[PDB]
Every structure is written in structure tokens, then in C-alpha cells.
């Protein structure tokens, strides 16, 4: 049974609601982005209309084998009519193809569904600038002040500098980056670029990256692992055992591994600054956990909501416990009293 916070009132629309069977009343299923918790339930035998970005559409077709007749890609930043209702897709600053959706209801109500997003001041000059939003369905992943982390630019600067130093000191070192979904591609792309290398990966991960409309992608990635000194592996293999095993396969070409595990927030954010971050080391293998987030920090979220001044907020993350729900409701009231809406 589909939960209330995935239904759009006054419409036949659901958002990220593919694991509940045939939802009664739903004429169009929107998909904000290609992450498994959100697409859960979609497969090649789906037979209702799916509305999404072009990039999400590419992934549905090629990775999940959803038939072409049911995929409805929409351009960004463009007023579109779907089943008699005006909608707009906006960039979410999440993973490739991720969108927020603006719905202009027949009765005059305006609803923004953020999907998953990393709020940014640039959103204050999108098509949101114009007008009033009555209901906000909000990605509240990190809605508590303890959730701090650096900008994506600061994290990438650290990764580039760390990798360039290590390989200039030891030209026989291999760099490895963990992945388990789309998103955070800048980490491995920026490291490979500083090292003058393509990024090597499995056939399955290459296929995924070929769906993302990244400019000049054929110049940046490869399935030929031997030609590359930056490799991608599943996140699960980024540990001393898995990396030891990988180094064996490389045919005495390398004598050191430097590995990166992009995480979200971890409690080491509460003590250590990005500049002060150190790896876990065993012999000739070192592993860095780096806090590269594709969700809003608490401060970024607060800024966005205080700018938008929505009449009602509906959280879409951390809704499963009374304590979490109460905590979020308290912050929403603080933000409203401070800003005066
Ligand atoms: F949005 C929320 C609000 C509250 C919580 C509960 N845990 C928060 C604690 C542990 C880690 C940092 O503070 C989770 C998500
Ligand atoms: Ni996501």
C-alpha cells in the first residue's frame, strides 16, 4: 500500500511509487532519479506511463529494460502539460538525471517535490523565483544540526591533491575508487584527469556511464583495465582483503594501492576537518573515507526552506519513528519563527 507522502493531491500522480503494485487512481508515475530505493519495483514488464528526465529514461531502457513505449522523457526548465496538468522538471543537484518536480494544480495550488537534492543558492534563480509554493515535499535526509560536511569542491581538491602526490612519489601506485550506484562521478573523473589516465571499469559499470550524457565520455573511461591507473570497483570490495585480491590480478604492474571510499556523512565529521583526514593503512594499501555528499547539509536545507517560505512541509525521509518526526517538526517551526513566514 502506497504511503500518503508519495501521492500528489488533486491529481492522478504518484512520485517514486513503483513497489506497491497498481496504485488505484494513478494515470502517470513520476520517477525523480535512478537510485534503487526510488525505482524499487520497476522492471521490463511495467505497462504504465513513466515520466522522468532524459538521463533517467536512458537508464530505464538500457539497464532495467523498460519498454520504449512507456518511457516519457521531459526537458528541464520547460513548462509541459501531462494529463491536463502543467509541470516543470528542475535540476536537483543530486546524481546525473535527478530532478525536482513543480506541479501547478487545477485549483491554483502549487506543489514542489524535491526528490533527493543538495540545496544550493543557485536554485533561488531557477523557475522557483517567480512564485508561491503551498506544499513542499522535502528530502530531509540530514535535517539535524549535527550533520555538517564540506563543499563538493573542497572534497575534490583534497582527493586530486592526495592522489597526485602519491603517484608522483611512486609511479607504480594504483588508484582505486569505490562505487555502488550512479552519483559522485566527479571523484573518479577528477582524479583520473590529474593523473593523465582514463578510468578503467567493468562492462556493467561502463554501460551505466554511457547512459549519462557526460560530454566527451569516450575520452574519459574504458573497459581496458591494463591501460588505466585509476580503477573502479564495487564499494563492497574497498577493504584490505578485496584490494589485496585486486592487486594480485594486475600482473606485477603495481606495488601500492591508494583507495577512496566516497561516503555520505560519518561521525568523524564531528571531530576532524577535511584537511586533517588520514587513511586506514595495512602494508602497501591505504584507504581514505571522503565525505562527498549529494544531499543538503542542515544549513543548506535551512537556507533553501527559509527562502522558499512554503505554507506546509511534508518530509519524505526519516518519517518512520516518532522521535525523528518530532525533531524535524521542531526545526521547521524554528525556521518559520526566525524568518517570519
Ligand atoms: F533528520 C534526522 C533527524 C534525527 C535523526 C536521529 N539521529 C540523529 C543523530 C545521530 C547522528 C546525528 O544526530 C536522524 C535524521
Ligand atoms: Ni538518491
Residues with Cβ within 8 Å of 216's Cβ and at least 6 positions away in sequence, in order, are none
Residue 306 phi, psi (nearest 5): -65, -30
Joined together, the cell numbers standing for residue 334 give 524554528
Residue 201 phi, psi (nearest 5): -160, 165
Which ligand lies nearest to the CA atom of residue 322 in the structure? 1
**Cβ 200 vs Cβ 176: under 8 Å:** no
| Alpha-carbon span 268 to 275, nearest angstrom | 13
**CA distances from residue 284 to 170, 206, 259, 287, 340 in whole angstroms, order as listed:** 11, 28, 11, 11, 57
C-alpha radius of gyration, the chain, whole number: 22
Domain 148-295 classified CATH 3.40.50.12650?
yes
**CA distances from residue 86 to 102, 109, 133, 273, 321 in whole angstroms, order as listed:** 8, 12, 14, 45, 35
Best CATH choice for the domain 1-147+296-341 from the list 1.10.3480.10, 3.30.950.10, 3.60.15.10, 3.20.20.70: 3.60.15.10
* Binding-site residues, ligand 1, Cβ < 6 A: 140, 143-144, 146, 318, 324, 327-328
| Alpha-carbon span 216 to 158, nearest angstrom | 25
CA of 285 to the centre of ligand 2 (A): 30
The three-point CA angle 310-316-322 to 5° equals 105
- Identify the residue whose C-alpha is closest to ligand 1 atom 10: 146
Pairing of strands 199-200, 230-234: parallel
For the beta carbon of residue 275, count every other beta carbon within 10 angstroms: 10
Best residue for ligand 1 mutational test, from 315, 327, 328, 335 (most atoms within 8 Å of Cβ): 327
Domain ranges for the chain: 1-147+296-341, 148-295
Q: Around ion ligand 2, which residues have CB less than 5 A away?
A: 35, 116
CA of 318 to the centre of ligand 1 (A): 8
- Identify the residue whose C-alpha is closest to ligand 1 atom 5: 324
Joined together, the cell numbers standing for residue 183 give 552519483
Q: What is the resolution of this structure in A?
A: 1.6
Amino acid at each position: 500500500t502506497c504511503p500518503f507522502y508519495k501521492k500528489i493531491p488533486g491529481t492522478g500522480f504518484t512520485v517514486d511509487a513503483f513497489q506497491y503494485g497498481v496504485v488505484e487512481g494513478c494515470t502517470a508515475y513520476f520517477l525523480t532519479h535512478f537510485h534503487s530505493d526510488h525505482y524499487a519495483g520497476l522492471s521490463k514488464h511495467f505497462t504504465f506511463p513513466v515520466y522522468c528526465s532524459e538521463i533517467t529514461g536512458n537508464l530505464l531502457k538500457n539497464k532495467l529494460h523498460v519498454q520504449e513505449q512507456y518511457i516519457h522523457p521531459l526537458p528541464l526548465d520547460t513548462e509541459c502539460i501531462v494529463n491536463g496538468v502543467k509541470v516543470v522538471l528542475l535540476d536537483a543537484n543530486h546524481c546525473p538525471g535527478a530532478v525536482m518536480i513543480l506541479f501547478y494544480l487545477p485549483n491554483g495550488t502549487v506543489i514542489l517535490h524535491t526528490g533527493d537534492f543538495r540545496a544550493d543558492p543557485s536554485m533561488e534563480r531557477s523557475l522557483l523565483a517567480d512564485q508561491k509554493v503551498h506544499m513542499l515535499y522535502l528530502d530531509t535526509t540530514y535535517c539535524s544540526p549535527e550533520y555538517t560536511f564540506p563543499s563538493q569542491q573542497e572534497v575534490i581538491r583534497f582527493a586530486i591533491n592526495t592522489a597526485f602526490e602519491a603517484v608522483t612519489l611512486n609511479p607504480h601506485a594504483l588508484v582505486v575508487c569505490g562505487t555502488y550506484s550512479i552519483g559522485k562521478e566527479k571523484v573518479f573523473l577528477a582524479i583520473a584527469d590529474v593523473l593523465g589516465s582514463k578510468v578503467g571499469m567493468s562492462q556493467e559499470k561502463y554501460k551505466t556511464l554511457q547512459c549519462l550524457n557526460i560530454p566527451e565520455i569516450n575520452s574519459l573511461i574504458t573497459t581496458d583495465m591494463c591501460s588505466s591507473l585509476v580503477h573502479l570497483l564495487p564499494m563492497m570490495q574497498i577493504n584490505f582483503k578485496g584490494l589485496q585480491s585486486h592487486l594480485k590480478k594486475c600482473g606485477g604492474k603495481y606495488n601500492q594501492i591508494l583507495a577512496f571510499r566516497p561516503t555520505g556523512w560519518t561521525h568523524s565529521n564531528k571531530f576532524t576537518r577535511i584537511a586533517d583526514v588520514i587513511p586506514q593503512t595495512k602494508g602497501n594499501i591505504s584507504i581514505y573515507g571522503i565525505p562527498y555528499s549529494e544531499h543538503s547539509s542542515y544549513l543548506e536545507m535551512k537556507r533553501f526552506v527559509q527562502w522558499l517560505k512554503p505554507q506546509k512541509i511534508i518530509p519524505t525521509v526519516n518519517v518512520g519513528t516518532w522521535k525523528s518526526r518530532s525533531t524535524m517538526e521542531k526545526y521547521f517551526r524554528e525556521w518559520k519563527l526566525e524568518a517570519g513566514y
